[PDB]
């Protein structure tokens, strides 16, 4: 399960609300050989991708995180929409499709920002 | 207590009940704590009572939480109180 | 000096589990046929430190699964020719005879769970066990069904152990586990083909073994009732499956007069009968009549189900609840889960 | 009020996969022999919420694997005595006859992938499906090869569904899926041993069923062409494997005259022949001659491959591309991957 | 193994000391198909719960951690005992049982504290 | 358009091409959109054209992306333009 | 795969450069039963060691990290070489072998430093 | 400019492993019977970059496991009728004859470990190997036991390779691996039933092959001793199992006079004998006497165990240590573990 | 060195020892480095020595780390020193 929040089928705002509730409940505590092995192979792969991604994200300063806030401002040319228009009415699929062609630009900027901050900190 | 007192030569029936309808094991006892009649497993079990040769029940009703106790050829000398030890309750009834 | 709330992960705190266990076990025999698809091959192959746990055999839940799996096995495998359910509903089945010889099965924990075991020989009961270990699987248990005597079970490690939820009360049974088995040989010889006999049989119990065993039991019973002579009696009445001692071998339903045991070899008179009551629930069933040739059961008396009189003291055999029979073997085990998260006071603070 | 870029992990965004699926499936028969080592035992055993997906059966890729695995099976299992590849190259093989009866196989996703399924009965085509669910494995499909009539496939849930990439154009075929099957019985009886007959056979189609079926098809075709009378015709010409209706049972190659169907039982005249063209690529092959004894095929007509005239309207049977036959069953499925990482505008900032 | 420190059977103080020692040593470097699969199924489940819990704990500000210190003071009404009485004489089981009915109250407070701090930081 | 116009009694050959060499299915049509000749699967398929009894191709060349069309016993009455609907292209040629 | 960067066979400097590039590409998105089970047993073990090590490293203040910078100065007596001599010309194997006998000394110092810092922070 | 200590995880630094490997391998034959439960089915199916590793065949440890597993196999499978252990202790066993034909087995690394392999053809010895790759499993090795000639092993890739820990010293053996095999045919024909012959046998070695082989060996030996003529001699004395050339086929213990090889076909005179010394440890064993019918061994001479005289130069055959025989195949492999943690100087500091 | 020097016609025994009791392979040599006697595998191996027809050992003692060397029919001409190359040690003894 990579879709940790289960958002396909609902908008992003709802997904965030759902997470808060479920996380609380979880913390609170509120042929058979062939398919047996295949069922586990699937889980092992998913774990490996997860662990990998969690450290790869350090390149943007976001390792060990599910959610990570930046110091790179949004360029309105990439969307020209408000926060509620996007978060309340669009699903993640609709949203990523809307901005599918700015991805490399954005990722590049995130890397650059992280580099500059690391530089600035080591200078002191 | 509830009183259902008959006379010598009669036949009487008392019903003990369960609220959960689980055909729960139970035992009917007199004031001298002698086991008379109960439900053991799915079987009717009798104790060494003076009623051992006279008492019976309705097995098909155990599934409805109803545990009737029938005493045939009742004697006035059997006048006593008895306990329905069914589930949590310990209902006392005079017969 | 300021006390603060802190949280730790990996805290080894147990809670009782409500999960379902799986079966593991080892020629057309009905239990083997069932096991072929019902159970996995067994496991080819941990005492805890200073811990204490309140095991309670009369309030366990491993029992419900055992008493659901056995009914399913039994009902599928031993078809009555006529089965009546109470209005009423009557159905019929084909009735081939089947081989019937219970085999051991093991219950094993699913991923995420473990089974605690009490290793205290002087188990006593529902009080705290001061000797606890963990397993995935229980030992194998043969799902033998019988009424007054518990047959082919395990023996107590050293001494006869009397286990009862409330000995004083008498509305509850007393399960007596022996530390010695007594052999019993039951058979229906050939040349008994009369109609008015194919339904007659007898059992032999060693005289000395039986008498030695009762003397040992009484010495233990006297601990609870030290000022009274103990007398054993026969049954009081009720359904014949429990009035006399009932059991099943080869698919045949046997009944035996145990009066001589509770009143060379001791010989009991036994019978085989076609119409029986069900232990699976309320209802009746007819099974096909007996077959020709010599029939024999060979068994170990490993325990007794006794009750005591209310108001010298008297005890007698009885039984009828297969759950009681299951408890006599499952009392040593409990299934638990771990909740690896806890809170404790500390002496540090978060920087804010 | 300042908008910032933020990143989330676990974002459920799909992309189409380019992966390879595995086969799962259930006496020397060639498909069973193949399956023995080619496929795994099948899986002994999820509708999505408010999602929409553009499935496109004519642009799918599950097809290429199906049309590589079948050629491999077929070529290894049904050896021509003579095989000519175009200069030219000619090789030969031993030609034992083999049992030939197609069995269902399932395609299943490898770790990291899943298959989307469209559950809209009124599927229509390449437009968005508003009813989507997920599976690991598809249903089983029998890799039956035939030309004009699609045999032994699945039926439409309620109504005849006409699926075509471009109905208006006519350079493309029309796949008609029936919501009812029509039974056809084809056989070569004994006592037909003449040389100048072992190669003659006939097929019986229920008259009423065929006529009922065409009336239903026409009523549906008229939706596209409401002002025209619809006339069915026979084939125009070209390679005999597609001019007439070809199929294979028992390893024998059958050809049938379907003119009476597109012009009691309707009887078609059929023949069996030793020299055929290949569907695997361009080339020819010779197979060993027919055997003695009665030969029978039993099949379900489940669909048709039709084309329409260009420039009253006329339709006729045709076919020849096994890929078209595969699409008729694989149209409901798509394979995708998840890229769990996304970007969104937010209203927070990193402390720096 | 969820019981990372192995504390059932010993008091909490001892468990913490044991961890420090073992962690140092570890860093320093000082039927066969059926049960085969079941043995792995058990490990895969445990891993998944672990990874999950490590991010769920972010709700209290404790993600990616085994041990996490707070800004929520202890309410003496929940125990009325000293630090050494609890840490030196009680096992984790005894301890959690002692405070078993304040758990939801405490968890609620931890969430609240985390929310307030996040709010305060974003205000700046 | 390309023009390859013959006379009554001739035989002519036109070649349509593919750039990918995939033996792609294709169809040859006249200006009245009548299917004449094409590649269906691995087989030669004809349409209900006046050329149905006269036209042919070169099957072994389909693998090279070459889809020639041969018309035997050509009539001047067959003078028209036709389309090579091969791959993306829709090449028009007069015959 | 414990050799996350694949450095056996190349020098350390090259390995670090390779990581940066590959991490970017990854984020950007640019008998069958017996050996089946053994293949997974190997992965499950590796995962467990990984997760374990990531928290064990908290003893030196480096948990949840692949790379961790210190406050313990290098003692030149352990090497007497420059940064580029080591990073550009030596492989990890050559390097660890060069300093193989100072490992316990160094690890001890790292623990000590972490202890002192934790102490200093809680004093405030 | 300030140098600081930093730590990295995932550092690919190797250390030698001390672990245990598992066996993998492919009719009542003793090795097959053993393998049935001792070994797993084999694996149906990596050169490193610029790395160097010091493999040392005389100081390896894969050998001890091979030389524990084989003794266990052998002792369980080939029962002596009389076995004497030195006081003394004598036991006996039933002695059925068994089929005896060694099969290849593979050693494979357990989870967490890998095996390094040296791929340098000019291996030479314990010095650094500049061509290293990794495997889970080694190639299969047949656990053949023999004394003077190494039979049925692998061949050198190009040239005869002489491997010896210390050639100069002579207290150590020289293992010669041939790049060519020489075929030898050994047999005991029928019609040899005399008592005073069932124990007589002979072997044929091609004259040319043997002579060609020695010329090649000498040319290689002369590299170490360029100014001396090389003479081969026969054995000096000691236990008969090593004085002459001993081997076992079919369970029979053969001895052969190799003098003609170290002094058409060359014919050697051989014998079969009932009382032997053990190679498993110090002691003796008696095996049941020989059987009737023709007996044949067919083998490849792949190497030699030679020693050299101390104080023209002389060499002779010898042997007796099965560990030496194991080294001749295991020299290419080493088992290692990874310690993914390292320290390096850097140029950054932690914020404090 | 240790000296155990006998005379012509005698029989002598020298013991070489191992500390680990591993029945370690070993070889006995003279000052001219001629292998005389050793332990190869579990077997007694002799070298091309003048003692080849006279020397022996005690196989059962190899398990105790004791590697005695017995020379029967000793000659004064055999007077030399010899090395016990057992384990790490290279003990020299005169015979
Ligand atoms: C306590 O544990 C012990 C040990 O497990 C249990 O004792 C076993 O009880 C079974 C009951 O059947 C008994 O099984 C018989 O063993 C005989 C040994 O030779 C078998 O010959 C006999 O097979 C015949 O009878 C079967 C009846 O179902 C038939 O199915 C089978 O085909 C055979 O039938 C032939 O013979 C009959 C003769 O009457 C003839 O009619 C048929 O046509 C046919 O010719 C059973 O296998 C075990 O041997 C007992 N074990 C021991 C050690 O004695 C004991 O029952 C447990 N106690 C309880 C109450 O369960
Ligand atoms: C649509 O689906 C249906 C259902 O799957 C398919 O119909 C099946 O088609 C196969 C085709 O062979 C048919 O199989 C025959 O069934 C007979 C039933 O008794 C068998 O007897 C017969 O076996 C003989 O012929 C085989 C030919 O390959 C031999 O291999 C086999 O050894 C047998 O041969 C004996 O008899 C012949 C007589 O001529 C003699 O020469 C031989 O020497 C030998 O004596 C086949 O198994 C199935 O029964 C059909 N199923 C049904 C339900 O009828 C149908 O084909 C699918 N449609 C398409 C186009 O694939
Ligand atoms: C080097 O590698 C090669 C290849 O692996 C090894 O050569 C093989 O050596 C075995 C040794 O037995 C030999 O096996 C015999 O092959 C014969 C082929 O027909 C078989 O007939 C013979 O079986 C009989 O003898 C067995 C002895 O154990 C009996 O167990 C078996 O039941 C048979 O016995 C019958 O015949 C005897 C006749 O004397 C009679 O007394 C019995 O009562 C009974 O009638 C063996 O299987 C292989 O064939 C050899 N392989 C080749 C290719 O020739 C070689 O040994 C390896 N070198 C070394 C030193 O190990
Ligand atoms: C002090 C101190 N700090 N950390 C430790 C310590 C000591 C031993 C082990 C662990 C530890 C940490 C995280 C995980 C595991 C673990 O065993 N698994 C990972 C989760 C799934 C099960 C396997 C152990 C920390 O001492
Ligand atoms: C620069 C830079 N920073 N991080 C990387 C990088 C590049 C490639 C891979 C990884 C990485 C990180 C953590 C884990 C793994 C991994 O392969 N597994 C998880 C642990 C068990 C084995 C599988 C890879 C980091 O470059
Ligand atoms: C022994 O069993 C009795 C049964 O009621 C129970 O009351 C008692 O506390 C038990 N004692 C111990 C030590 O378990
Ligand atoms: C006791 O039982 C055994 C069992 O076979 C029998 O042989 C013996 O004769 C019996 N003896 C008496 C006296 O009951
Ligand atoms: C139905 O199929 C036709 C085929 O071209 C397509 O154009 C049309 O959009 C499809 N409609 C829907 C709703 O899928
Ligand atoms: C129709 O086909 C069935 C199939 O067996 C046959 O029996 C029947 O006689 C046929 N009838 C006619 C009139 O075609
Ligand atoms: C070759 O083997 C000899 C044996 O002692 C060793 O000394 C030498 O260094 C080895 N050389 C190489 C390159 O391995
Ligand atoms: C050994 O037997 C094989 C069997 O083919 C034969 O080719 C070979 O030349 C023989 N060699 C000798 C030396 O007899
Ligand atoms: C050499 O050996 C082969 C093996 O069969 C035999 O046939 C041949 O006659 C032998 N020849 C001589 C001359 O030794």
CA-closest candidate to residue I6, choices I88, I82, I74: I74
Q: Which two tokens stand for residue H9?
A: 């995880």
For chain F, state the CA radius of gyration. 12
Scored b (16 or more CB within 10 A) or e, A40-55 reads bbbbbebbeebbebbb
Is residue D258 within 8 Å of residue D245, measured between CB atoms? yes
Q: CA-CA distances (angstroms) from residue H33 to A106, H22, H36, H107, I9?
A: 65, 17, 5, 18, 56
Is residue C268 within 8 Å of residue C260, measured between CB atoms? yes
Is residue A32 within 8 Å of residue A111, measured between CB atoms? no
Q: Do A and G share at least 3 CB pairs under 8 Å?
A: yes
Is residue D138 within 8 Å of residue D106, measured between CB atoms? yes
Distance CA F62, CA F25 (A): 9
- Alpha helix positions (H), chain H: 30-38, 62-77, 207-221, 240-243, 322-330
Question: What are φ and ψ of residue D249, in 5° steps?
Answer: -135, 130
Is residue C146 within 8 Å of residue C279, measured between CB atoms? no
Q: Is the CB of H110 under 6 A from ligand 10?
A: no
Interstrand relation of B2-3 and B91-94 (parallel, antiparallel or unpaired): parallel
Distance CA D206, CA D265 (A): 5
Q: Which two tokens stand for residue G31?
A: 């008998």
Distance CA H225, CA H246 (A): 30
Q: How many contacts does E have with G, using Cβ atoms within 8 A?
A: 40
Interstrand relation of F91-94 and F2-3 (parallel, antiparallel or unpaired): parallel
Distance CA C78, CA G30 (A): 64
Question: What are φ and ψ of residue C227, in 5° steps?
Answer: -100, 10
Q: Residue written as tokens 């294709």?
A: F26
Report the nearest atom of ligand 9 relative to the CA of D267: 14
Distance CA D70, CA D150 (A): 17
Q: Is the CB of D58 under 6 A from ligand 8?
A: no
Distance CA A111, CA A60 (A): 5
Is residue C281 within 8 Å of residue C129, measured between CB atoms? no
Element (H, E) at A41: helix A34-56
Q: Residue written as tokens 């009623």?
A: B51
Q: In the beta sheet, which residues pair with residue C246? A: C255
Domain ranges of chain B: 1-95
Q: In the beta sheet, which residues pair with residue H14? A: H338
Nearest CA in chain F to D147: F41
Q: Do C and D share at least 3 CB pairs under 8 Å?
A: no
Experimental approach taken: cryo-EM
Pocket test for ligand 2, best of D187, D287, D296 (most atoms within 8 A of CB): D296
User: Which residues make Cβ contacts (< 8 Å) with residue C221, sequence separation at least 6?
Assistant: C162, C230, C315
Domain H4-346: give its CATH superfamily: Human immunodeficiency virus 1, Gp160, envelope glycoprotein (2.170.40.20)
Pocket test for ligand 10, best of H59, H126, H331 (most atoms within 8 A of CB): H126
Distance CA I44, CA I36 (A): 11
Q: Residue written as tokens 């599950």?
A: D62
**Dihedral angle sign, alpha carbons of residues A76, A78, A80, A83:** negative
* Residue C4 DSSP SS3: strand
For chain E, state the CA radius of gyration. 19
Q: Is the CB of H166 under 6 A from ligand 10?
A: yes
Contact: C171, B85; criterion CB under 8 Å: yes
CB contact E50 to A (< 8 Å): no
Is residue D258 within 8 Å of residue D268, measured between CB atoms? yes
* Residue C197 DSSP SS3: coil
User: Which residues make Cβ contacts (< 8 Å) with residue E58, sequence separation at least 6?
Assistant: A23, A66, E64
Contact: G92, H5; criterion CB under 8 Å: no
Is residue C5 within 8 Å of residue E113, measured between CB atoms? no
Neighbour count for residue B73 (Cβ, 10 Å): 13
CA-closest candidate to residue F28, choices F69, F71, F88, F73: F69
Question: What are φ and ψ of residue H227, in 5° steps?
Answer: -100, 10
Is residue G33 within 8 Å of residue G73, measured between CB atoms? no
Interstrand relation of H284-286 and H275-277 (parallel, antiparallel or unpaired): antiparallel
Q: Which two tokens stand for residue C340?
A: 């690896």
G103 exposure class (CB count in 10 Å sphere: 0-12, 13-18, 19+): middle
**DSSP summary character for residue H8:** E
Q: Do B and E share at least 3 CB pairs under 8 Å?
A: no
**DSSP summary character for residue A77:** G
Question: How far does residue C218's CA lie from ligand 6's centre (Å)?
Answer: 19
User: Which residue minimizes the CA distance to atom 4 of ligand 4?
Assistant: G56
* Residue C66 DSSP SS3: helix
Contacts of B27 in chain C (CB under 8 A): 171
**Dihedral angle sign, alpha carbons of residues H86, H92, H94, H96:** positive
Is residue H260 within 8 Å of residue I20, measured between CB atoms? no
Distance CA E69, CA E59 (A): 14
Is residue C309 within 8 Å of residue B30, measured between CB atoms? no
Q: Which two tokens stand for residue F1?
A: 């358009």
Neighbouring subunits of F (3+ Cβ pairs under 8 A): D
Is residue D204 within 8 Å of residue D266, measured between CB atoms? yes
**DSSP summary character for residue F32:** T
Distance CA H149, CA H316 (A): 11
User: Which residues make Cβ contacts (< 8 Å) with residue C301, sequence separation at least 6?
Assistant: C149, C150, C151, C178, C181, C182, C183, C184
**DSSP summary character for residue F42:** T
Angle at E45 between CA E39 and CA E46, to 5 degrees: 90
Q: Give the minimum alpha-carbon distance from C283 to chain B in angstroms, rounded to a whole number.
A: 8
Pocket of ligand 7 (CB under 6 A): C 204, 264-265
Q: Which two tokens stand for residue D296?
A: 């029978």
Helices D62-77 and D322-330, axial angle in degrees (round to 10): 130
Distance CA D75, CA D279 (A): 11
Pocket test for ligand 11, best of H149, H180, H183 (most atoms within 8 A of CB): H183
User: Which residues make Cβ contacts (< 8 Å) with residue G27, sequence separation at least 6?
Assistant: A53, A56, A57, A59, A60, A107, D341
* Residue D300 DSSP SS3: strand
Element (H, E) at H305: strand H295-308
Q: Which of residues 78-117 of H touch I (CB under 8 A)?
A: 86
Distance CA E124, CA E116 (A): 13
- Which of D168, D236, D277 to mutate: most F Cβ within 10 Å? D236
Q: Which two tokens stand for residue E105?
A: 């109250």
Distance CA D262, CA H267 (A): 87
User: Which residues make Cβ contacts (< 8 Å) with residue C144, sequence separation at least 6?
Assistant: C102, C151, C152, C153, C325
Pocket of ligand 4 (CB under 6 A): E 1, 4, 19-20, 22-23, 46-47, 50, 66; G 48, 51-52, 55-56, 58
Distance CA H259, CA H316 (A): 10
* Residue C169 DSSP SS3: coil
Contact: D238, F25; criterion CB under 8 Å: no
Q: Which two tokens stand for residue H125?
A: 């010895």
Scored b (16 or more CB within 10 A) or e, C34-58 reads bbeebbbebbeeeebeebebebebb
* Residue D154 DSSP SS3: coil
Q: In the beta sheet, which residues pair with residue C255? A: C246, C271
User: Which residues make Cβ contacts (< 8 Å) with residue D136, sequence separation at least 6?
Assistant: D43, D108, D109, D114, D115
Distance CA B29, CA B48 (A): 11
Q: Which long-range contacts (CB under 8 A, 24 or more apart) does D209-218 make?
A: D209/D182, D209/D183, D210/D182, D210/D261, D210/D266, D213/D178, D213/D180, D213/D182, D216/D160, D216/D180, D217/D160, D217/D176, D217/D178, D217/D304
Q: Which two tokens stand for residue G25?
A: 């590409």
Angle at F58 between CA F55 and CA F64, to 5 degrees: 140
Is residue H41 within 8 Å of residue G34, measured between CB atoms? yes
Q: Residue written as tokens 């004998």?
A: H273
For chain H, state the CA radius of gyration. 24
Distance CA H94, CA H288 (A): 10
Q: Mind spelling out the 3-state secondary structure of H222-262? A: CCCCCCCCEEECCCCCECHHHHCEEEEECCEEEEECCHHHC
Question: How far does residue D307's CA lie from ligand 8's centre (Å)?
Answer: 18
Report the nearest atom of ligand 10 relative to the CA of H127: 14
Distance CA E65, CA E29 (A): 23
Contact: A24, E51; criterion CB under 8 Å: no
Nearest CA in chain I to H278: I42
CA F72 to chain centroid: 12
Helices G103-122 and E12-28, axial angle in degrees (round to 10): 140
Q: How many contacts does A have with E, using Cβ atoms within 8 A?
A: 40
Distance CA C39, CA C25 (A): 6
CA-closest candidate to residue D203, choices D157, D145, D158, D244: D244
Question: How far does residue H292's CA lie from ligand 3's centre (Å)?
Answer: 13
Distance CA C65, CA C69 (A): 6
Pocket test for ligand 8, best of D59, D127, D173 (most atoms within 8 A of CB): D127
Contact: A56, G26; criterion CB under 8 Å: yes
Q: Which two tokens stand for residue C352?
A: 């804010």
Q: Do E and I share at least 3 CB pairs under 8 Å?
A: no
Q: Residue written as tokens 């913390």?
A: A27
Instruction: Nearest by CB to G31, from H41, H338, H347: name it.
Output: H41
Distance CA I25, CA I3 (A): 24
Q: CA-CA distances (angstroms) from residue C92 to C82, C83, C287, H96, H192?
A: 5, 6, 10, 59, 77
**DSSP summary character for residue I59:** G
- Alpha helix positions (H), chain C: 30-38, 62-77, 207-221, 240-243, 322-330
Q: In the beta sheet, which residues pair with residue H174? A: H306
Distance CA D215, CA D225 (A): 15
Neighbour count for residue E72 (Cβ, 10 Å): 18
Is residue F55 within 8 Å of residue F46, measured between CB atoms? yes
Strands (E), H86-173: 89-92, 105-108, 114-118, 128-129, 132-135, 149-151, 161-163
Distance CA I74, CA I54 (A): 8
Q: Residue written as tokens 């299992």?
A: D77
Q: In the beta sheet, which residues pair with residue D108? A: D22, D137
Q: Is the CB of D166 under 6 A from ligand 8?
A: yes
Pocket of ligand 6 (CB under 6 A): C 124-127, 165-166
Element (H, E) at D333: strand D333-338
Q: CA end-to-end span of chain E, whole Å?
A: 43
Distance CA F50, CA F73 (A): 11
CA-closest candidate to residue C339, choices E22, G56, E8: E8
* Side-chain half-sphere exposure of D116, counting CA atoms within 13 A: 27
Scored b (16 or more CB within 10 A) or e, G16-25 reads eeebeeebbe
Contact: E40, A43; criterion CB under 8 Å: no
Distance CA C20, CA C111 (A): 11
For chain G, state the CA radius of gyration. 19
Q: Mind spelling out the 3-state secondary structure of D37-74? A: HHCECCCCCCECCCCCEECCHHHCCHHHHHHHHHHHHH
Question: How far does residue C123's CA lie from ligand 6's centre (Å)?
Answer: 9
Q: Residue written as tokens 């060349």?
A: F61
* Residue G86 DSSP SS3: helix
CA-closest candidate to residue D266, choices D203, D213, D200, D319: D203
Is residue B28 within 8 Å of residue B82, measured between CB atoms? yes
CA-closest candidate to residue H280, choices H75, H64, H88, H142: H75
Experimental resolution (Å): 3.5
Q: Is the CB of H96 under 6 A from ligand 3?
A: no
Closest ligand to residue D203's CA: 9
Q: In the beta sheet, which residues pair with residue H65? A: none
Is residue D24 within 8 Å of residue D39, measured between CB atoms? yes
Distance CA C141, CA C154 (A): 9
CA-closest candidate to residue I10, choices I79, I73, I93: I73
Neighbouring subunits of I (3+ Cβ pairs under 8 A): H
CB contact G33 to A (< 8 Å): yes
Q: In the beta sheet, which residues pair with residue C23? A: C107
Q: In the beta sheet, which residues pair with residue I16? A: I67
CB contact F61 to D (< 8 Å): no
């Amino acid at each position: 399960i990579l879709g940790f929040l289960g958002a396909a089928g609902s908008t992003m705002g709802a997904a965030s609300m759902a997470l808060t509730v479920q996380a609380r409940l979880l913390l609170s505590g509120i042929q058979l050989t062939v398919w047996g092995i295949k069922q586990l192979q699937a889980r092992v792969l998913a774990v490996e991708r997860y662990l990998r991604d969690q450290q790869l994200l350090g390149i943007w300063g976001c390792s060990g995180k599910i959610i990570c806030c930046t110091n790179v401002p949004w360029n309105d040319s990439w969307s020209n929409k408000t926060i509620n228009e996007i978060w309340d009415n669009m699903t993640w699929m609709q949203w990523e499709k809307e901005i599918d062609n700015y991805t490399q630009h954005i990722y590049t900027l995130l890397e650059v920002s992280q580099i500059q901050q690391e530089k600035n900190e080591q200078e002191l | 207590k509830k009183v259902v007192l008959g006379k010598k030569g009669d036949t009487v029936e008392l019903t003990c009940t369960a609220s959960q309808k689980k055909s729960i094991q139970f035992h009917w006892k007199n004031s001298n704590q002698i086991k008379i009649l109960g439900n053991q497993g799915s079987f009717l079990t009798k104790g060494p009572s003076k009623l051992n040769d006279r008492a019976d029940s309705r097995r098909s009703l155990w599934d409805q939480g109803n545990f009737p106790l029938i005493i045939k050829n009742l004697k006035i000398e059997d006048s006593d109180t008895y306990i329905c030890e069914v589930e949590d309750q310990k209902e006392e009834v005079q017969l | 000096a300021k006390k603060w709330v802190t949280v730790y992960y990996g805290v080894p705190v147990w809670k009782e589990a409500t999960t379902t266990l799986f079966c593991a076990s080892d020629d057309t025999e009905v239990h083997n046929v069932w096991a072929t698809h019902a159970c996995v091959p067994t496991d080819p192959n941990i005492v805890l430190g200073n811990v204490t746990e309140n095991f309670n055999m009369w309030k366990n839940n491993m029992v419900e699964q055992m008493h659901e799996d056995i009914i399913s096995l039994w009902d599928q495998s031993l078809k009555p020719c006529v089965k009546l359910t109470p209005n009423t509903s009557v159905i019929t089945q084909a009735c081939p005879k089947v081989s019937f010889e219970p085999i051991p099965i093991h219950y094993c924990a699913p991923a995420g769970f473990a089974i605690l075991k009490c290793n205290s020989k002087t188990f006593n009961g529902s009080g705290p066990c001061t000797n606890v270990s963990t397993v995935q699987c229980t030992h194998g248990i043969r799902p033998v069904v019988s009424t007054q005597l518990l047959l082919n079970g395990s023996l107590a490690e050293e001494e006869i152990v009397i286990r009862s939820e409330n000995i004083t009360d008498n509305a509850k049974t007393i399960i007596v586990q022996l530390n010695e088995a007594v052999e019993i040989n039951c058979t229906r010889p050939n040349n008994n083909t009369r109609k008015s006999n194919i339904r007659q049989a007898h059992c032999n119990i060693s005289k000395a073994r039986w008498n030695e065993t009762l003397g040992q039991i009484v010495a233990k019973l006297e601990e609870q009732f030290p000022n009274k002579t103990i007398i054993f009696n026969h049954s009081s009445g009720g359904d014949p499956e429990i009035v006399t001692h009932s059991f099943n071998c080869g698919g045949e339903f046997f009944y035996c007069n145990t009066t001589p045991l509770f009143n060379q070899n001791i010989t009991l008179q036994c019978r085989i009968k076609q119409i029986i009551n069900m232990w699976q629930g309320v209802g009746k069933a007819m099974y096909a009549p007996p077959i020709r040739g010599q029939i024999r059961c060979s068994s170990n008396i490993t325990g007794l189900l006794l009750t005591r009189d209310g108001g010298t003291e008297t005890f007698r055999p009885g039984g009828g609840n297969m759950r009681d029979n299951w408890r006599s073997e499952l009392y040593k085990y409990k299934v638990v889960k771990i909740e690896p998260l806890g809170i404790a006071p500390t002496a540090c603070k978060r920087r804010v």
